[PDB]
Design a binder for these strands. Structure first.
Lengths: 36, 52, 134, 176, 421, 56
RNA sequence: GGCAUUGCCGCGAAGCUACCAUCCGCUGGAUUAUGGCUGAACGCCUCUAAGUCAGAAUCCAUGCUAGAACGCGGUGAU
RNA sequence: AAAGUUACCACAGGGAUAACUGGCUUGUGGCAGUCAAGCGUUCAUAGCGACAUUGCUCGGCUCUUCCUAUCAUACCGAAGCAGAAUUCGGUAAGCGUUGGAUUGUUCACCCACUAAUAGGGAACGUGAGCUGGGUUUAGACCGUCGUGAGACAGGUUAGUUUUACCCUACUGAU
RNA sequence: AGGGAAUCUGAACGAGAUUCCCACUGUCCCUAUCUA
């Protein structure tokens, strides 16, 4: 068959570093939500 | 419409090809090879024209 | 609908926007083509009819009874050089067509002038209302 | 085609020779094919299958548990309300454009003490938090206290809004 | 429209209906937008989706409303027949709920598009779109009962018989399981059970037959003892331009007293008083003459085991319903036998020739061997038709040898004269 | 315009400004009405109205 | 015949050309959804787990086009 | 006597930034209640709580390539699927996806043909492959005359990527 | 010796404008060939 497009496993540097910022954002939320 | 490579039409045409459809070609081939065998003898007579 | 047996290719002489004469004694004298039923599809190509093809056509010069309604029309005279299987190329004097229902049954009682051989073969009831064939 | 053309055909000729073998083996295959679908079906079909299968589990929990229990026994882009004296009202609202699409007249109000929702027209916008401009514009952001018409009809005349009508469709309020 | 309704688009059970319309708006519309686009393209995206789902539900609802027959506008027989088979009020309640729901969905779509041209973020716009299609879903979830009813009515009206109230009809009546099932069994091709209990038949079975070159339809009935099955029979008697064939069992069979048939005949008498009744028998004999006291009645005695009197009942029924120089023939044709299709001993036609020779479109018919000649050795005709610029058929006549010799005389009359020097 | 001319007093065609200018419209007025007691029946019917003029 | 910014008109070969003309445009395996066989897991069952047959205009071949100018071969010529 | 107040606040001035895919986006709304797997620092009476459910309600001409979220063509499954016709669903991108009248703001649509006339991408694809209709003598700064209200054909200004007998893709040729 | 008929505009008009009717044409369907 016509073999469809494969997703990449190369994580671009913008993605990888943006992943770190989103992670640390989830921390700051979790520390605040722990107090209530 | 059924394609050129439609499986059922290829199988129906294979039902054809085991019948009359090949037998006529296998008679024509014998008539062609016969006249080919006839073409040796004429040239062999023209060999014997010079051999005379 | 209506056409008897297979239909083979003859040259196309009557596109959309062509005025042909009317041949039956129904009342109409001429016919204006608007669409051709059972035609091919290119980009920018107009639908072109030929002899013995049912077109959708309007009356332009005729009786008011035959007007007010767009109706099927089978072309009986072509005047463009088509080919027969018996050697010859032929053409007529003018473009003419006859009006009928979608079933292929004729409204008129007689068709004037020659009717094409191919058209009379394909449509049986046209050959029933024919005076002259070929 | 008369009335029961296949039921009479069953009651005279039967289903098939193998109709019971095909059915029984298929129902026995379905225990596998549920699991064969759950580990295949990539994409949206997997998400829809998971939601339907979770539903088919909670419903079964309800059947079994109920059986066990029965065993014992500048323009504004926010939604506003404008009073019926609109024709020449803005003395102090020089160029404060409020389009007619964003004007919702009937708030979908629920009653607290009796769990019935009465879809009634708004009479007056009273106290919008966040902005005292918005009180004078009639903006219906979350927390706004509004006046409710009780023409259709113990009742409380005021209701506090609970949704964000900029996001969803209607205005949803709870009486005080 | 007319007599029957099989051609109705199917009715989805309100949960699947949602799964059709909402999935189609996910597949047919574009689905991917960034938050980083212009606000105009974000607006137009979600507007296109709310509207498309709007048209989706409306298309499915319109198919139901136009599909089902407008009960009180069709025909008095059908208006009442559907009223007997289905709760007519509920049939109008259900279709009213669909007509209500379509206008609701239209209102929702027109609302949220108007509300959508003021969205400031992708989130707000998304919340408004989800609000719209979710609201439509809630409306369709409120339709789980009437659509479940509408599927069952669609299936059962799709299988209903087509009676024509304008063709020559004849009702077949009597007590349930008299033997009238055997009558329609032996008059036409319609499979009706003669099972030995009361209500075997549950609806109006129809049988067509032809007599005196005309289309007739005899309508079998379940019978009268009130029920939906029972009232179906009575309204068929009342509204059809017909004659009624009340059947009686003058025997131990049926399991009902003949006097109860007398009581029922004289009780139902008012509504078949206008229809010119025929009565067929399949102190005591005197109470058959009590039945004869009706203005328009006739009594006939018949047996269904024999095939002559069953036909004679039909003959009298149809008769009641109507009132309500020399040619040239060759002796080779006259002496010739008829063509019996199931005869082992006859001539083989060309149809059987082409089968024996194999195939329809593969066999070439020999035009030769079928035409008459002096010598059948020259049957395989060649016939040149053209020789050197001039066609043979124009030169072709009988006595061309004698005509040539006449031209040979015309040779020698110019040979000695001296034209060739 | 002819059957208008013989059934009314003054028949005036316009196509005023604030039309399309490309469309083949005419707004023709027919002020003054005869209101006859004897109306010609063959006149008003469309069968005789569009009876085409003979060839030259 | 010189000549006419090819003065103008009719026909018109060769050439070029038009579905405005004519001809020609395929057959084997592997599969998808699906339908199955034997059959475990699980002392029933079960198209699947080990196996296994069929099955789409799908795929890969056959066919159709170029030939690597740093791929190769065989053969003629002193 | 004039004074308190101002997020009712209208004009001139000073501050503070706005507008960065941190895998975006798609089909099922919101509000309140009814259940309610559990978790709450013990734990249902510190509270959160999914699926349901109940309440009313800038446009368009033309080509190349790609995507499938497929309208048709191919094969299937479900459907009161008698046959025909059809509805929903699965695999599926191999191949197809037409011709005319349309301009009070078209962000509409008409009337046929066709097997069907499917939806999108090529981030300002396709305005240096191009036109058909809109700003008002549309940028920025400064000045003059002006109560709440605006003008002056004042005055100063900026509006450079387009051609490359570059570069190389692509066709073909030595 | 290219038409014709209406209308909008300043009864014919004026190479005013628009619409329609009739005729004509490679503008097009659909390009093909020749010469400079």
């Amino acid at each position: 068959m016509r073999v469809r497009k494969r997703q990449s496993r190369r994580t671009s540097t913008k993605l990888k570093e943006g992943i770190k910022k989103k992670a640390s954002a989830h921390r700051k939320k979790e520390k605040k939500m722990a107090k209530k | 419409a059924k394609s050129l490579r439609a499986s059922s039409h290829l199988n129906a045409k294979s039902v054809k090809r085991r019948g009359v459809f090949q037998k006529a070609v296998d008679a024509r081939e014998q008539r062609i090879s016969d006249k080919l065998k006839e073409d040796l003898l004429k040239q062999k007579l023209e060999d014997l024209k010079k051999k005379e | 609908n209506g056409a008897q047996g297979t239909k083979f290719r003859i040259s196309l002489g009557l596109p959309v926007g062509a005025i042909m004469n009317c041949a039956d004694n129904s009342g109409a004298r001429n016919l204006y083509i608007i669409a051709v039923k059972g035609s091919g599809s290119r980009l920018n190509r107009l639908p072109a009819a030929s002899l013995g093809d049912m077109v959708m056509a309007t009356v332009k010069k005729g009786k008011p009874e035959l007007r007010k309604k767009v109706m099927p029309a089978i072309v009986v005279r072509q005047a463009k050089s088509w080919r027969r299987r018996d050697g010859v190329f032929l053409y007529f004097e003018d473009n003419a067509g006859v009006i009928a229902n979608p079933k292929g049954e004729m409204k008129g009682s007689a068709i004037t002038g020659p009717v094409g051989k191919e058209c009379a073969d394909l449509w049986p009831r046209v050959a029933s209302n024919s005076g002259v064939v070929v | 085609p008369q009335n029961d053309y296949i039921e009479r055909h069953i009651k005279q000729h039967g289903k098939r020779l193998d109709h019971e073998e095909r059915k029984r083996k298929r129902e026995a295959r379905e225990s596998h094919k549920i699991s064969e679908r759950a580990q295949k079906l990539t994409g949206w079909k997997g998400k829809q299958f998971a939601k339907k299968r979770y539903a088919e589990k909670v419903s079964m929990r309800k059947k079994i548990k109920a059986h066990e229990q029965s065993k014992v026994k500048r323009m504004i882009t926010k939604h506003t309300f404008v009073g019926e004296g609109f024709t020449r009202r803005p003395v102090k609202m020089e160029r404060i454009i409020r389009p007619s699409a964003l004007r919702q007249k009937k708030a979908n109000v629920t009653h607290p003490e009796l769990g019935v929702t009465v879809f009634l027209p708004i009479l007056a916008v009273k106290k919008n938090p966040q902005s005292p401009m918005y009180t004078q514009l009639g903006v219906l952001t979350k927390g706004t206290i509004i006046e409710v018409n009780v023409s259709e009809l113990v009742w409380g005349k005021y209701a506090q809004v609970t949704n964000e009508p900029d996001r969803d469709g209607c205005v949803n309020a709870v009486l005080l | 429209m007319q007599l029957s309704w099989k051609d109705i688009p199917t009715v989805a059970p309100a949960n699947d209906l949602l799964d059709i319309v909402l999935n189609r708006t996910q597949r047919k519309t574009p689905t991917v937008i960034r938050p980083g686009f212009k606000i105009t393209r974000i607006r137009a995206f979600y507007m296109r989706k709310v509207k498309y789902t709007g048209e989706g539900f409306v298309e499915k609802f319109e198919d139901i409303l136009k599909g089902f027959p407008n009960i009180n506008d069709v025909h008095p027989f059908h208006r009442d027949l559907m009223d007997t088979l289905y709760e007519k009020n509920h049939y109008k309640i259900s279709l009213a709920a669909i007509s209500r729901a379509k206008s609701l969905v239209e209102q929702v779509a027109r609302d949220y598009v108007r509300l959508l041209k003021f969205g400031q973020s992708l989130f707000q716009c998304k919340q408004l779109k989800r609000a719209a299609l979710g609201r439509m879903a809630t409306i369709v979830k409120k339709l789980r009962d009437p659509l479940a009813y509408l599927e069952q009515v669609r299936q059962h009206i799709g299988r209903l018989p087509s009676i024509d109230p304008n063709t020559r009809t004849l009702l077949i009546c009597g007590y349930p399981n008299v033997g009238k099932s055997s009558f329609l069994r032996c008059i036409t091709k319609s499979d009706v059970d003669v099972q030995p209990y009361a209500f075997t038949t549950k609806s109006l079975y129809v049988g067509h037959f032809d007599y005196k070159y005309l289309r007739f339809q005899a309508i079998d009935t379940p019978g009268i003892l009130m029920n939906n099955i029972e009232m179906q029979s009575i309204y068929a008697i009342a509204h059809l331009r017909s004659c009624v064939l009340y059947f009686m069992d003058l025997s131990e069979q049926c399991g009902f007293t003949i006097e109860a048939q007398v009581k029922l005949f004289h009780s139902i008498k008012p509504l078949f008083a206008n229809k010119s009744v025929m009565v067929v028998i399949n102190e005591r004999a005197q109470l058959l003459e009590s039945v004869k006291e009706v203005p328009g009645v006739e009594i006939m005695t018949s047996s269904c085991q024999l095939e002559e009197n069953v036909m004679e009942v039909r003959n009298k029924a149809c008769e009641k319903l109507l009132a309500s120089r020399t040619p040239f023939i060759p002796e080779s044709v006259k002496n010739l036998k008829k063509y019996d299709p199931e005869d082992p001993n006859r001539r083989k036609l060309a149809r059987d020739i082409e089968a024996e020779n194999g195939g329809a479109g593969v066999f070439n018919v020999n035009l030769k061997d079928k035409y008459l000649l002096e010598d059948d050795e020259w049957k395989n005709d060649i016939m040149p038709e053209i020789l050197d610029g001039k066609n043979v058929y124009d030169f072709l006549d009988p006595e061309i040898a004698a005509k040539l010799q006449a031209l040979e005389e015309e040779e020698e009359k110019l040979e000695n004269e001296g034209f060739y020097n | 315009i002819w059957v208008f001319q013989q059934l009314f007093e003054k028949v005036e065609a316009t196509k005023p400004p604030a039309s399309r200018n490309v469309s083949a419209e005419i707004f023709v007025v027919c002020k003054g009405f005869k209101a006859p007691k004897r109306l010609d029946p063959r006149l008003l019917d469309p069968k005789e109205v569009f009876e085409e003029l003979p060839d030259g």
